[PDB]
Amino acid sequence: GSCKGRCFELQEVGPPDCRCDNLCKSYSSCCHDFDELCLKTARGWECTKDRCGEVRNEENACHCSEDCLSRGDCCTNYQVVCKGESHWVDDDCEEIKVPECPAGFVRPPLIIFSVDGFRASYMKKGSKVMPNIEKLRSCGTHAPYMRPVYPTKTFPNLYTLATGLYPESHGIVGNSMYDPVFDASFHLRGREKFNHRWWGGQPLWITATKQGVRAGTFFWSVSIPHERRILTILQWLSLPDNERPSVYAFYSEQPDFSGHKYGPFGPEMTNPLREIDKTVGQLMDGLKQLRLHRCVNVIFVGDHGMEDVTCDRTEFLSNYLTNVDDITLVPGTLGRIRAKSYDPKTIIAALTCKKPDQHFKPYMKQHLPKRLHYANNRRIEDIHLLVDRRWHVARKPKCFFQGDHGFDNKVNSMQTVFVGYGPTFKYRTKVPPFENIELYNVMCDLLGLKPAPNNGTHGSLNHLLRTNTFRPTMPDEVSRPNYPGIMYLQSEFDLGCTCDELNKRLHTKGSTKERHLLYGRPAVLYRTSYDILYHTDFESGYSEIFLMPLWTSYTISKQAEVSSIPEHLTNCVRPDVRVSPGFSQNCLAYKNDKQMSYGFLFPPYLSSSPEAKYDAFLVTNMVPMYPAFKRVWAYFQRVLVKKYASERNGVNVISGPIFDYNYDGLRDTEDEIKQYVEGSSIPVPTHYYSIITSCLDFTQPADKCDGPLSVSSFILPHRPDNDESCNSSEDESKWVEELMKMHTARVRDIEHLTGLDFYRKTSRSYSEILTLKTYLHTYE
Numbered sequence: 001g002s003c004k005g006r007c008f009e010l011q012e013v014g015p016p017d018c019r020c021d022n023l024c025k026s027y028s029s030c031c032h033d034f035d036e037l038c039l040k041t042a043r044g045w046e047c048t049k050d051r052c053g054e055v056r057n058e059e060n061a062c063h064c065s066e067d068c069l070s071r072g073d074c075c076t077n078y079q080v081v082c083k084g085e086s087h088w089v090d091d092d093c094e095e096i097k098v099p100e101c102p103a104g105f106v107r108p109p110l111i112i113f114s115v116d117g118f119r120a121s122y123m124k125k126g127s128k129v130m131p132n133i134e135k136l137r138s139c140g141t142h143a144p145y146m147r148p149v150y151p152t153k154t155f156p157n158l159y160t161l162a163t164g165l166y167p168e169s170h171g172i173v174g175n176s177m178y179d180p181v182f183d184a185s186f187h188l189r190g191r192e193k194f195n196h197r198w199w200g201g202q203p204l205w206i207t208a209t210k211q212g213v214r215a216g217t218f219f220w221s222v223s224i225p226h227e228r229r230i231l232t233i234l235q236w237l238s239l240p241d242n243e244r245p246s247v248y249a250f251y252s253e254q255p256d257f258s259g260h261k262y263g264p265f266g267p268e269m270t271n272p273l274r275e276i277d278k279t280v281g282q283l284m285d286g287l288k289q290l291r292l293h294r295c296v297n298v299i300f301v302g303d304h305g306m307e308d309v310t311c312d313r314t315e316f317l318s319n320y321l322t323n324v325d326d327i328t329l330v331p332g333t334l335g336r337i338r339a340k341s342y343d344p345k346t347i348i349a350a351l352t353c354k355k356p357d358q359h360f361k362p363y364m365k366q367h368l369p370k371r372l373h374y375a376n377n378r379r380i381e382d383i384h385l386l387v388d389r390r391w392h393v394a395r396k397p398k399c400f401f402q403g404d405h406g407f408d409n410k411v412n413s414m415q416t417v418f419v420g421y422g423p424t425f426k427y428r429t430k431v432p433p434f435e436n437i438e439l440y441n442v443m444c445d446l447l448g449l450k451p452a453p454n455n456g457t458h459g460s461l462n463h464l465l466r467t468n469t470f471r472p473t474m475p476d477e478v479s480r481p482n483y484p485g486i487m488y489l490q491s492e493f494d495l496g497c498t499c500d501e502l503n504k505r506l507h508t509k510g511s512t513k514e515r516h517l518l519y520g521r522p523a524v525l526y527r528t529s530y531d532i533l534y535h536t537d538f539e540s541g542y543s544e545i546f547l548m549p550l551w552t553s554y555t556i557s558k559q560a561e562v563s564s565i566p567e568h569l570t571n572c573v574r575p576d577v578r579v580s581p582g583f584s585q586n587c588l589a590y591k592n593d594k595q596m597s598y599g600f601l602f603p604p605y606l607s608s609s610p611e612a613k614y615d616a617f618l619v620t621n622m623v624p625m626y627p628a629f630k631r632v633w634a635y636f637q638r639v640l641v642k643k644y645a646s647e648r649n650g651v652n653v654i655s656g657p658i659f660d661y662n663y664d665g666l667r668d669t670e671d672e673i674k675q676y677v678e679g680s681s682i683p684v685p686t687h688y689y690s691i692i693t694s695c696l697d698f699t700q701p702a703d704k705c706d707g708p709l710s711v712s713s714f715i716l717p718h719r720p721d722n723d724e725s726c727n728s729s730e731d732e733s734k735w736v737e738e739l740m741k742m743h744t745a746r747v748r749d750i751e752h753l754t755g756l757d758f759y760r761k762t763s764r765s766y767s768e769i770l771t772l773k774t775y776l777h778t779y780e
């Protein structure tokens with residue numbers, strides 16, 4: 001019943017046996033002598049000239065003896081003080097082309113150094129405040145920042161780091177949660193969070209174990225000091241090959257904790273940060289003693305950022321809801337609302353655009369921006385509040401706290417850090433910002449593990465690594481397009497559409513692709529049947545199942561001209577002579593549908609001539625749109641496409657419908673579609689997307705780009721009102737573009753939602769294209 005020889009053992013035991021592992025305290029299950037033998041502090045964590053060559057005294061926190069290296073329990077500065085060696089930080093960056101490991105090491109180990117609440121902008125503090133972290137960043141591979149998941153809270157983000165999955169898929173949807181199946185709640189404080197039932201997916205430590213790669217315990221009882229956590233990792237690395245883990249995690253509650261008290265603005269954040277840097281230097285000094293500093297891959301990574309949030313900036317739901325004791329609220333930098341043991345429609349309405357200075361917005365979770373991927377889990381309440389940065393929402397009525405996090409993950413203040421350092425990482429390399437969902441695959445790559453299915457795009461971060469085992473390959477196209485000729489007469493069509501001889505070579509099976517499909521046809525990766533339709537100004541992939549385009553592709557040059565829709569073509573809808581009446585929409589559906597109207601994917605505002613404009617009124621270019629949404633879409637088409645073309649030296653636009661009625665972020669099947677236009681087989685999209693591509697080199701036009709591409713995309717909610725936009729009663733120039741920015745999207749998001757694969761034909765490497773597809777334009 002003792003921890004003698006068992007401190008931070010990788011075994012777990014009992015009862016009636018008592019434990020000595022990293023989490024024995026959190027279960028109050030340690031042996032009588034744990035704190036004595038395992039949580040030692042005597043003589044601190046640094047050697048002194050005095051202690052060099054001491055006979056081992058087991059009561060010291062760490063040792064300065066000749067045997068200390070054999071056990072890996074030296075003070076981290078032992079060789080510096082007692083062998084005339086240099087601190088790691090004081091050594092010059094030297095490139096590590098190959099892993100340089102002690103005898104018996106079969107792979108380079110991975111150490112994940114996770115820091116809680118470490119905002120990206122903290123890195124600017126410099127080698128003055130943080131020399132060790134600055135060396136890792138400079139010598140190794142780093143990003144300017146790493147995007148967390150939503151909500152930007154510890155437990156969702158740390159588990160996303162571990163699994164490569166969105167909170168909705170791994171299950172840890174918040175620091176606080178209620179699961180209606182368990183009829184139980186998850187809390188930061190308590191033992192409940194230790195129950196495995198909450199934790200889905202497959203975290204790295206499990207992935208590694210299943211594939212015969214031993215893992216260190218990632219979790220550390222809060223009582224264990226950081227120096228001890230580092231020393232434990234170093235002792236573990238000192239173990240024989242058949243006991244030694246290949247993957248380790250250190251975790252620090254800082255600088256988060258100080259961020260809460262001080263805020264990210266505090267000049268007093270420097271001390272916390274300097275502590276962290278010290279811990280890093282201890283780790284690197286430690287590795288250097290053990291001859292592991294050119295062997296181990298080190299990842300320095302945060303879980304989220306920190307914002308200035310004071311208790312005076314608090315919205316109270318009681319000031320909006322007159323029935324506030326009928327609801328439970330997960331409060332703070334977000335809101336999640338639920339009935340206590342109640343009508344969500346009147347709740348939302350009562351929370352919508354009530355006050356000028358309203359610092360939150362209510363959403364049914366399916367209406368939240370799709371980039372957040374925050375809906376598909378029974379643990380996520382139907383009603384959600386997006387709270388403005390710097391604010392809080394509480395249920396009912398100086399501060400102790402001055403900082404917090406949890407906000408929308410595109411907010412600057414929420415951004416966090418990534419540094420990769422070691423033989424497998426690149427030397428002195430800066431990489432673009434990326435999302436934390438991508439890291440799991442990398443960590444698997446760094447350990448030679450086959451990753452479990454996750455939300456990362458494997459390959460999109462190959463550019464971080466000197467050597468990558470994984471080679472991404474484009475998916476095979478499943479459905480082939482038809483390329484139909486003019487194979488129907490006008491008189492054959494009876495659609496119910498009003499619209500006021502010519503030599504017919506019109507549906508130009510030529511020139512179009514070259515000027516309107518710049519990056520290849522989208523591959524359809526599901527089994528369906530569709531037709532490629534050509535026109536002077538646009539090309540489309542028309543679905544015969546959904547009776548509208550899956551994608552509409554067109555290029556608008558810098559100097560493109562914008563025209564209006566004439567009075568005589570306002571209600572013009574024309575039949576296509578390449579597609580049968582049966583596989584066409586009809587106007588009667590819309591004239592019968594009191595709520596639903598129609599718009600066009602290719603805009604009639606950007607036709608290249610009066611003649612070409614008639615093709616924009618084809619029934620095959622038509623899609624169901626609520627009047628409310630047409631305000632948005634029309635403004636996009638008439639004003640904003642032109643503006644983007646003007647700013648970016650031409651744009652290629654790929655627009656289309658999205659069906660996600662079950663809000664799983666994935667292309668609906670026909671069966672999952674829950675709304676059609678009245679009395680028709682024509683489905684109503686939940687969203688409309690556009691992918692706006694151009695040359696990164698803006699001195700080259702979009703259609704004549706010889707190099708990297710620039711992308712911006714959105715997934716607009718197809719809503720019957722504009723209640724989401726509080727200034728929607730004003731001119732569209734005052735609110736539409738802001739709505740679109742809120743609903744910015746990765747191409748990869750659109751791919752999940754459509755089952756299309758974009759950018760198949762380019763001059764760029766496929767891994768670069770994966771990077772392009774993972775890009776998110778944030779407007780922050």
Ligand SMILES: *[C@@H]1O[C@H](CO)[C@@H](O[C@@H]2O[C@H](CO)[C@@H](O[C@@H]3O[C@H](CO[C@H]4O[C@H](CO)[C@@H](O)[C@H](O)[C@@H]4O)[C@@H](O)[C@H](O)[C@@H]3O)[C@H](O)[C@H]2NC(C)=O)[C@H](O)[C@H]1NC(C)=O
Binds near residue numbers: 169200
């Ligand atoms: C983010 O990545 C997630 C993981 O790849 C994606 O979730 C997966 O989504 C698919 C399709 O909806 C599901 O596939 C079905 O799986 C069932 C049962 O097998 C799996 O069951 C559990 C579910 O928790 C899973 O964890 C196990 O690994 C099992 O393999 C099959 O019977 C069906 O035929 C079908 O294949 C996956 O279950 C699901 N996995 C997880 C872990 O969520 C998610 O779609 C991605 N999100 C986006 C937006 O792309």
Ligand SMILES: CN(c1nc(-c2ccc(F)cc2)cs1)c1c(CCNC(=O)c2ccc3[nH]c(=O)oc3c2)nc2ccc(C3CCN(S(C)(=O)=O)CC3)nn12
Binds near residue numbers: 116159220
């Ligand atoms: C989730 N988590 C931890 N994750 C890692 C980790 C993950 C991936 C990496 F690449 C590196 C490291 C290490 S520890 C975790 C924690 C962290 C504790 N924080 C807080 O309590 C906290 C900190 C700051 C906050 N600010 C704020 O507003 O709220 C804050 C909260 N604690 C625990 C406890 C238990 C677990 C479980 C994970 C799942 N396993 S399982 C079933 O897979 O074996 C069980 C343990 N987990 N955890």
Ligand SMILES: [Ca+2]
Binds near residue numbers: 664668
């Ligand atoms: Ca779906």
Ligand SMILES: [Zn+2]
Binds near residue numbers: 117153155303304
């Ligand atoms: Zn955190």
Ligand SMILES: [Zn+2]
Binds near residue numbers: 256260
């Ligand atoms: Zn915090």
